């Protein structure tokens, strides 16, 4: 007879338990992951009403409110900084503007922060894969002054240093350098935060970006001259941070100054049979977005969400498919994943959205689904606790109810794409895996989650499949 809704609920609970056990057994098999390129410092301030109003008044209230109506491209004055914050509160929208002015950068440091944590997709994933999962990790740190180095947690996290010719791997706190602090000031505000007449529709953040190095992808000399020797020490690589690249720069350089070098790294990784996963974050420039699609055949794997997959369909699908993917309509998402895998021949695509994940793979097996389940629990644990510290904290995410609507979506999906096992579907020359996720009702954290999902699935899948 058909498995009822209450039966599929029990069945997903058992799959989640077994997948957590299998991931914990498999993860010790991973002998190294490389993470590149973006690592910075995040300085978080929880905005205060009086303090923010006083600063708007000091600088000139008429100049600030004008900036909310006509926003600039980047921050070049204190008026523009505080205009962007109030616009972010008014619209309720996640914004990030680059700080060009040295005077504003001094003003931001004096205003300060309530909390400091590692930033950047590579930097955050070093603390997760190295600190929590204990996988030996080499991370790219474009500028490593003391304030940056000491944001890394204890565990097997490593950065390359040159001893004349010989490359060594040491903890980041053992490699402090006289280098720039790359700080992103994150001004956070709750649901219905109010300042003057302006009031927030929902909770969000404005980011003031004072980081010259990750914006242009300037790489350490150890990754420029010693990449092959780094490669010899890992089995996996996760590449992120290319989404900032512009087609043209005012100094006449272009995006290929960085992408030719990235491609040279991929050539090395593939010569050593390292499996690589690209985080295809939204890339505003369409010519750069297309050059990154054309680099996908040299990756093993790609991670993307509904905005990021819709964006890629705008350049290689069609606009109507892109619209449907943006909304997370499962059959259009599948069609899009298939179009991307037909265009690139990439072996793995992991899609993640609100309620469910999909993974389309050229190879077959239950490990693909169990890695998705582990990633779901890692994400729910991070959102629950704010930041994770040990891998046993992810066990508590087993208590978070699985999203019941996505259990029902599984039926709809299965009527067209028959399953051979729960969450697992054969196609002619590929496999599709589906899991319903764990949505945390009152999350302590809303940032770093997408990377947590995408990294955790890729690394635990490899660990489980390794033979």
Author numbering: 1 to 467
Paper text:
In addition to this core ribokinase-like fold; other members of this superfamily have an extra small domain, which in the case of the ADP-dependent kinases is formed by a five stranded β-sheet with some α-helical insertions, the active site lying between the two domains. Our results indicated that Mg·AMP behaves as a competitive inhibitor of Mg·ADP and as a mixed type inhibitor with respect to D-glucose; the other product, D-glucose-6-P presents a mixed type inhibition versus either Mg·ADP or D-glucose. These patterns of inhibition are consistent with an ordered sequential mechanism in which Mg·ADP is the first substrate to bind to the catalytic site and Mg·AMP the last product to be released.
We determined the crystal structures of TlGK in its apo form (absence of ligands) and holo form, in the presence of D-glucose and the nonhydrolyzable ADP analog ADPβS (ternary complex, ADPβS·D-glucose). Both structures were obtained by molecular replacement, and refined to 2.05 and 2.58 Å resolution, respectively. The overall structure of TlGK in both states (apo-enzyme and ternary complex) shows the same two domains organization described previously; the large domain harbors a Rossmann fold (α/β/α) architecture with a central twelve stranded β-sheet surrounded by thirteen α-helices and three 310 helices, and the small inserted domain consisting of five β-strands and four α-helices. In the absence of ligands, the mass centers of the small and large domain were separated by 29.4 Å, but when Mg·ADPβS and D-glucose were simultaneously bound to the active site, the two domains underwent conformational changes causing the inter-domain distance to shrink by nearly 3 Å, that to 26.5 Å. The distance between the two side-chain groups is reduced from 12.0 Å in the apo-enzyme to only 3.4 Å in the ternary complex (cluster 2). Cluster 5 is defined by interactions between residues Lys74 and Lys246 located in the small and large domain, respectively.
